[PDB]
């Protein structure tokens, strides 16, 4: 059970940050498995993958989810020049994440349509700091906790809609909570 940061755990670079709210327990287990355990969040995102991730790799997780309130499930990554924070979600509760976000088009990857998504994110925490940057979005229809992800399905289908990437940093499987309560356990490979 760690707090807040970034390192590495059993051969996977992870990630675990929170807005200072408590009532969140993230966990990192053996191999690429990680915990979290929140009840009455803030803002939080944690879990596994890599460091930095690349623009072909083929994500695998299993596990399960079970959140009460906003949160969501789903490969989590950075590009720099430009910068970019996307997003593949595969399983979310109450809130689509999207929302808000102006459609750009849509993709049919790993058996199920995702709607794609771009909106633009102004003086908000990155990775280099505060700083306003593009987010992508491609939102899973059929929800589900496991699973393969191509994510060059969805890195081409936003590059056919004009959607740039630049040098990846981390890519992860992470479980997001936003004010509100859950468990998760996922393993990634």
Same mark, same amino acid.
């Given at each position: 059970?760690?707090?807040?940061?970034?390192?590495?755990?059993?051969?996977?670079?992870?990630?675990?940050? #929170?807005?200072?709210?408590?009532?969140? %327990?993230? @966990? #990192?287990?053996?191999?690429?498995?990680?915990?979290?355990?929140? &009840? #009455?969040?803030?803002?939080?995102?944690?879990?596994?993958?890599?460091?930095?991730? @690349?623009?072909?790799?083929?994500? #695998?997780? +299993?596990?399960?989810?079970?959140?009460?309130?906003?949160?969501?499930?789903?490969?989590?990554?950075?590009?720099?020049?430009? /910068?970019?924070?996307?997003?593949?979600?595969?399983?979310?509760?109450?809130?689509?994440?999207?929302?808000?976000? @102006?459609?750009?088009?849509?993709?049919?990857?790993?058996? &199920?349509?995702?709607?794609?998504? =771009? %909106?633009? =994110?102004?003086?908000?925490?990155?990775?280099?700091?505060?700083?306003?940057?593009?987010?992508?979005?491609?939102?899973? =229809?059929?929800?589900?906790?496991?699973? &393969?992800?191509?994510?060059?399905?969805?890195?081409?289908?936003?590059?056919?809609?004009?959607?740039? /990437?630049?040098?990846?940093?981390?890519?992860?499987?992470?479980?997001?909570?936003?004010?509100?309560?859950?468990?998760? +356990?996922?393993?990634?490979?």
């Amino acid at each position: 059970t760690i707090q807040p940061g970034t390192g590495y755990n059993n051969g996977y670079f992870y990630s675990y940050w #929170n807005d200072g709210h408590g009532g969140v %327990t993230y @966990t #990192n287990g053996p191999g690429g498995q990680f915990s979290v355990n929140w &009840s #009455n969040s803030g803002n939080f995102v944690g879990g596994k993958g890599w460091q930095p991730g @690349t623009k072909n790799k083929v994500i #695998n997780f +299993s596990g399960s989810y079970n959140p009460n309130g906003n949160s969501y499930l789903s490969v989590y990554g950075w590009s720099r020049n430009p /910068l970019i924070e996307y997003y593949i979600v595969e399983n979310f509760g109450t809130y689509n994440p999207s929302t808000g976000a @102006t459609k750009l088009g849509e993709v049919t990857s790993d058996g &199920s349509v995702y709607d794609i998504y =771009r %909106t633009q =994110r102004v003086n908000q925490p990155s990775i280099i700091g505060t700083a306003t940057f593009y987010q992508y979005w491609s939102v899973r =229809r059929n929800h589900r906790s496991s699973g &393969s992800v191509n994510t060059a399905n969805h890195f081409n289908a936003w590059a056919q809609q004009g959607l740039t /990437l630049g040098t990846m940093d981390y890519q992860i499987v992470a479980v997001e909570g936003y004010f509100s309560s859950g468990s998760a +356990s996922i393993t990634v490979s």
